[PDB]
């Protein structure tokens, strides 16, 4: 906090008010506030000490190959797939790929199918569409002289 | 007096830029010639380094 | 594929069994026509079209700035199908910071809302967002995020084909003696963008104020291409895209 | 303050100075696509010629370095001629001291070492060019070796260069997956020129006229460049495909 | 010209030599490589890596023969290895193959390449090499021996070790699986097993370059009938041969 | 700003600044005026003492038996280049038995000053010479700029208040070219030229140093009471 | 697709080819492939109007093929080839193909021939889902009747 | 981003550009107009040589120097720096003449200078040249014409130009090549070099100028580089007056 | 404007070509607004004046004020930046809104390094107060706003430091360079200041110009 602007002073008041009454919410039949943040280096540690927020859940952006194949598999069961397509060709390509990017990738493959005028998602579509929404080369791009 | 502060030569650096120092310096410059005649105002600069200017 | 189709027929997306896309991010080097592309599609599609500079919704006042933004989608839903168009979302879609000042931390309060407004538990029916940006690199990672915005259209610099088309769009309109110099000019005019082309027509036209000709010479076209080229290169080159 | 201003290491273990060369390569906007035929190697490249006043015969990015080794240059044209001169020279020297014409493999490693030394000086600027050396060897057959400003190189089944080369890499990779044979096959070199030109017309989404192409083919015991007159006879040959 | 005759490795103020520290960062960016010393061989191992599949791996090399009795394998920068392999072959001929007529012992050659290291941690206009090498070999009086030559210019004799991005996890696996009798065939099963946990990309006999410094093969000697000399002890394993031992996991 | 430290660093104005700086050494320098006709060249220099006890510093260096140069910059810098000109004038007499052309001698001079200004750890030479001589195409007056640049003029000046001298030469331009054979008159026309570059310092028999070269007169330096007829 | 040259003229050029149609018929007897070439060389013109005009002729040869009892195979392969190249437009062809299906009905061929022929026709419209979809169900009910 | 990147030249800037050498194109921008018309039988150089004072000696200064007997070299920008680049190619050409006893080809000579300017950009210790040259001549392989940028870039040319009036020149040379895209005469091209120096004198119409013209032509000069002087030079002058009227 | 002192074009001594280039982009589309409509081309959206300091870019604008007799909105770029959140942006939109009304218009901006540049992305700080007020400037130059009755005259003595989005022909169409006086032009300058104080005719102006 800068702690001289009104914008900041008003959030100071909120932050103490939530925290105080979180202790008030103790010994109730209620399970206390669930809250999420895509960031985590920006939070005050006064929330993060025991007796307020207790359980800290980790979510990775890494997945192992058995756990990856499952995400592609549930989304693809909801859509239609050619008997000429497979999902085990899709997961070897990346070593790192978070669960939502899999969702969008699956979208792309089915969007591409409208262009081609296809009911099914043939693997051809699927492969081309896979490479779209990957990107992120800046250390393997032209920078293989670090291996 | 002493415009080693508020006198840094303008450069681009990608950290934040020299924006706070030069904001003040550029206000000054425009009122030392106007876009209209300035009144009777004599201005004395005094510096230790005419090289940060 | 994203804007016309699920408005007309979401029955197409239903065949495959897949969700319709919403959220388009357009990004490009400047003068590639990214603002132009949206202006053109707003008069065609024939739904309600909210036009929104991203930098006129931020007030002084404390979270009024967020109050406007929530309303903007709540209006949209109620006029559905509707389109929310945001220009230059570097302004309030900036990087995370949280080591800034009070001014920048304000930006976090408006951004955090707009992120939840797009996807939460609240779903959007046929509300579609086209955001335009001059760099996807200095936008927030949470915004940029796959699934937050769906289709990621690159707007490239006009290809060897494209150059000819653009030159013809601005030259049909003018008075001229008859210009057959585009065969030379497209060749000369490499490393340009759409805005500089549109300027070459204006520039050729200013040589004819001097000649007192009421027609633009094809000779005047050769000069224009050069006049634009030199100044452009010198004063600063243009952005590269990831 | 001085770690990204000579080729010394940074707190990261990276050499940014070496890295800026790789960001200079793609500022010329010249594309290249190179495939190994059955008994030839064909490389096709753009030849942008901006102004009317350039004499087009002189504009080139195919350099003859030997009878068997051509060298195709992407990156600025000053750095191109200095890498090209050093190459011809080393080719002569090899012939001189070892008594056979230089094999490509060896020229690839030779220009690589000179690249390596240029990033371990402090008074030498690494040449910012990606050179692709195309050949037909009598021991290792048609090859492609691509060197780069750092001093790494690897052989290639095909390779592309330029700023739109991400696109070109995609077409060629699909092609060699589907077929399942590492090199393109077709006996006559003329028709590998045809297949190669189609793949550049598909990838870049642009057609090419005779002055926009400049094509080099290394066949057996000779490297030639096709005259722009002869390149049209190939452009017509795509009209019956 | 040259006016760069001042060292760019300089003492840092709280101690340490800053360039050599930095260069060791650049070692741990690169591929993962390991070596296991048996009682009758040394095995060395590395993973190939390309820009795209369009690169060939057939013409690529990352394990090189310095002398027929002494091989090397690196983890760190590709460019620096490439020149330093060639300088290693050069000093090995010029300073023991013209003077004592034969290939140098493993202790001696290691000591020479550490001095090549040393004269780019010092002198002007130069920074440190950005590799760390295992230089494994066999000499007639110190047995099989595995070394690690580093950006500092030190050497350490080892019995099994690993270098590269998966170094931390690799050596703990190797500490617990080491034993004071291994055969060379038993050594291989350790090295492959470990290198499989550091790969997450594709695994094949074409993408793992594996080398043994076993025992003598007269089929690579090139000739027969001088029994005084005994063929390459160094023998790089072909893709077909490696693949069987992969199934053997 | 930071562009001024060395001789290698351009410069956003198209310049290099250090050569620009060395050109200001000529300006703080004393005046010498050259004028030529079609038959005799004249250098008219104003010598400069420090104090009353002091001597006056030689401003005209006879370079050869038909060449003389005059400094208007650094005295140490003038000594280096003068040797170099003598050397190449003597190398021409020895090898080709040829009086070194005046037009050629500006090109030899040229390149000695360029090669230290392109180089690191060198500097430009901050001295401008006016070089007279009489060769095979007649009288010549060269102005050597510390920029390296050589130009051939009918009359020039360099120094301080020098502009006032160019003007005297600029008026009297169509007169002096036409008087030939009469060295008395050229000399006087050059004394009056350098007198409009005064500002309370005057001219005397220890300030004025004249040297001429003619068709019919080899290189002569007049000083003392031999510049007492020609005030 | 569309072009600014073969609108009116080329429609009149297909009317010239129709006066040359009996020469084509007489040529079809000696080798069917020789007759077939002229109608395919006409279908290399981009324009919707001229596309519809040209293909009538191709369907008119496809009665000749269907009439003969060893030439019925050829038309199946051709229509495979028509989907695969690009046709010349994707509006034109989908209608013309139905006329082929129509002909299958009224030809009264050997039962052996009819079975194979309807399988070859359906294989083409397997991944597709536009106009084609409707047609496909129309020939499959008829194929299912034979079985 | 980091501060530096303009104090040397074997730095690259973070965008892969130079500095000094990009700064060096602005040194060349202050220079005198200089054009080259490639005719079928040779080259015609012409250069605006300013009379900057009334105290200069007319027709006794030149900026067109011959290298060997058949390659004219003509430069603009830093004039002393420019003589040094010509001087290097007189040593290089002379070495070629001894070793192989033929006059150095225009493509061979282009190659020899080119390296030289490029070599000064590879060190932090030598200042990159701030001149652009137009050079060509007639050799056994025909006529060729080259412009060599300060960047150590050169290309073939049918007309090239440099200096301040490069804007008007480049535009006026497109017209001459659209009058005669099938070639033009070397006698004729003297007169056109005159006309395109006087139209390009309009960025620089403050002052007065001497036109210097030279040609190397196969059919009037026998493929040797000589100066355009006497009556022919005065015809071209009278030509230019009547055009600008 | 309240009428800024007339300098005419006898106190913009020398630099003819710049006055010519400037009046074409700013003064003709006002007066001769009919002739470009006929030619079917569009008028500029602006001119930029850049060069070394002291070359009278500010002088030429002051002149231009007196000559066109339309509303001239004087602007200094650090005045626009404001410490209350996006009230710097309120200043952009209002000033330009104002220019629609009082049309035809000229906005003269002095400086442009206080709307700085767009290059910041580093976690530690940034200043995204400067960026926002700049990105608002661009949205007024865009097609949905007026631009055919609002000319923007921009003057700066750094041009390198600027972000490419202010630049490009079509935001600021003209890229006018100011050089320093020529030999003859220096003479012209000196003689136009000297009318204000006493002189004698010994003074030869030529000598002074040479110096
Ligand atoms: N793609 C294009 N085809 C045709 N005209 C174009 C194109 N791009 C730009 N132009 C022309 O140039 C004008 C100016 O471009 P415009 O201002 O729309 O660019 P932008 O890329 O959206 O800008 P900014 O980066 O400032 O947001 C257009 O109004 C149009 O006349
Ligand atoms: N060409 C000129 N003719 C007449 N007077 C001039 C000329 N150039 C400049 N001046 C005078 O010099 C004074 C100071 O220059 P001014 O501040 O106008 O320059 P600028 O280059 O627009 O500067 P900055 O970018 O530093 O604000 C002017 O007010 C004017 O009186
Ligand atoms: Mg100012
Ligand atoms: Mg916009």
XYZ file of C-alpha atoms in Angstrom, chain H residues 33-223:
191
model
C 24.851 15.346 -55.675
C 26.519 12.623 -57.773
C 24.750 10.561 -60.467
C 25.810 7.791 -62.853
C 23.901 6.999 -66.173
C 24.664 3.541 -67.531
C 24.596 3.809 -71.300
C 24.933 0.750 -73.505
C 28.549 1.412 -74.538
C 29.934 2.624 -71.160
C 29.114 4.978 -68.124
C 28.785 8.620 -67.629
C 29.550 10.102 -64.269
C 28.511 13.589 -63.418
C 28.853 15.353 -60.164
C 27.744 18.866 -58.853
C 30.918 20.450 -57.531
C 29.859 23.573 -55.473
C 31.665 26.917 -55.861
C 31.310 27.650 -52.172
C 33.179 30.917 -52.272
C 34.450 33.164 -55.098
C 37.970 32.389 -53.932
C 38.113 28.795 -55.274
C 40.047 28.095 -58.572
C 37.536 26.968 -61.170
C 38.222 23.727 -62.929
C 41.204 22.710 -60.828
C 39.403 20.656 -58.095
C 37.945 17.323 -58.914
C 36.119 14.562 -56.917
C 36.210 12.149 -59.884
C 39.376 10.162 -59.633
C 40.420 7.444 -62.060
C 41.522 4.038 -60.773
C 43.662 2.155 -63.241
C 42.971 3.503 -66.813
C 39.300 2.423 -67.165
C 37.436 2.672 -63.899
C 36.121 6.019 -62.822
C 35.239 6.356 -59.089
C 33.061 9.235 -57.857
C 31.966 9.730 -54.263
C 29.980 11.921 -52.003
C 30.025 12.469 -48.263
C 33.196 12.833 -46.300
C 35.609 13.894 -49.115
C 38.990 12.982 -47.426
C 37.560 9.575 -46.393
C 36.336 9.079 -49.850
C 39.886 9.599 -51.365
C 41.153 6.904 -49.054
C 38.659 4.357 -50.383
C 39.714 5.158 -53.926
C 43.375 4.970 -52.856
C 42.892 1.395 -51.417
C 41.403 0.278 -54.753
C 44.362 1.705 -56.700
C 46.691 -0.551 -54.653
C 44.327 -3.515 -55.015
C 43.886 -2.949 -58.738
C 47.608 -2.571 -59.275
C 48.248 -5.934 -57.509
C 45.721 -7.589 -59.853
C 47.362 -6.037 -62.899
C 50.778 -7.519 -62.018
C 49.519 -10.977 -61.082
C 47.256 -11.606 -64.102
C 48.160 -8.866 -66.575
C 44.677 -7.831 -67.526
C 42.730 -4.743 -66.267
C 40.713 -5.767 -63.142
C 37.115 -6.647 -64.144
C 34.326 -4.378 -62.828
C 32.770 -7.390 -60.959
C 36.256 -8.262 -59.590
C 36.868 -4.670 -58.442
C 33.499 -4.334 -56.924
C 34.307 -7.402 -54.864
C 37.729 -5.994 -53.759
C 36.406 -2.585 -52.433
C 33.344 -4.131 -50.878
C 35.273 -6.260 -48.451
C 37.302 -3.329 -47.493
C 34.426 -1.242 -46.249
C 32.928 -4.292 -44.503
C 36.192 -5.065 -42.767
C 36.102 -1.699 -40.933
C 32.655 -2.606 -39.437
C 33.982 -5.907 -37.902
C 36.317 -4.168 -35.358
C 35.511 -1.734 -32.541
C 38.799 0.013 -33.226
C 38.220 1.315 -36.908
C 35.698 3.964 -37.871
C 33.210 2.894 -40.580
C 33.356 4.809 -43.721
C 30.975 7.657 -44.299
C 30.998 7.862 -48.070
C 28.942 6.438 -50.848
C 30.709 5.902 -54.131
C 29.367 5.335 -57.630
C 31.946 3.557 -59.747
C 32.088 1.632 -62.937
C 33.954 1.641 -66.199
C 34.319 -0.570 -69.251
C 36.074 -3.829 -69.185
C 36.098 -6.893 -71.555
C 32.694 -8.186 -70.278
C 30.871 -4.976 -71.137
C 29.939 -1.923 -69.125
C 28.824 -2.208 -65.497
C 27.940 0.470 -62.871
C 27.972 -0.051 -59.102
C 27.017 2.006 -56.093
C 28.653 1.058 -52.864
C 26.752 2.111 -49.765
C 28.764 3.024 -46.519
C 27.351 -0.196 -45.095
C 29.597 -2.252 -47.376
C 26.660 -3.102 -49.561
C 26.832 -2.741 -53.348
C 24.621 -3.793 -56.230
C 24.274 -3.508 -59.940
C 22.726 -0.366 -61.264
C 21.326 1.302 -64.401
C 21.320 4.587 -62.621
C 22.446 5.409 -59.140
C 22.691 8.664 -57.170
C 23.976 9.945 -53.771
C 24.120 13.179 -51.649
C 21.454 15.672 -50.767
C 19.664 15.839 -54.067
C 19.337 11.943 -54.026
C 15.523 12.402 -53.828
C 15.187 14.365 -56.983
C 17.944 12.317 -58.717
C 16.381 8.829 -58.125
C 13.058 10.127 -59.397
C 14.626 11.749 -62.492
C 16.632 8.619 -63.401
C 13.326 6.491 -63.458
C 12.098 8.783 -66.271
C 15.229 8.418 -68.390
C 15.064 4.571 -68.198
C 11.381 4.701 -69.212
C 12.300 6.901 -72.240
C 14.894 4.388 -73.332
C 14.304 0.956 -71.719
C 15.937 -0.516 -74.804
C 19.272 1.421 -74.196
C 20.758 4.763 -74.898
C 23.675 6.267 -76.532
C 26.878 7.306 -74.742
C 27.171 10.553 -76.745
C 23.638 11.374 -75.752
C 23.971 10.393 -72.175
C 26.354 13.313 -71.489
C 23.604 15.644 -72.146
C 21.148 13.802 -69.944
C 23.652 13.751 -67.045
C 23.650 17.565 -67.372
C 19.901 17.780 -67.319
C 19.571 15.565 -64.176
C 22.278 17.487 -62.257
C 20.469 20.798 -62.881
C 16.994 19.470 -61.608
C 18.737 17.999 -58.636
C 20.303 21.326 -57.855
C 16.958 22.470 -56.500
C 17.589 21.200 -52.948
C 20.766 23.209 -53.154
C 19.410 26.224 -55.249
C 20.840 28.588 -52.624
C 24.213 28.450 -54.325
C 25.967 28.106 -57.719
C 27.779 25.079 -58.961
C 30.263 23.707 -61.598
C 29.195 20.620 -63.366
C 32.000 18.104 -63.934
C 31.252 15.254 -66.323
C 33.335 12.247 -67.362
C 32.765 9.211 -69.390
C 34.309 5.774 -70.056
C 32.960 4.518 -73.282
C 33.815 1.863 -75.718
C 32.939 3.660 -78.973
C 34.119 7.237 -78.553
C 36.984 6.818 -76.027
C 38.033 3.140 -76.709
C 37.119 1.984 -73.303
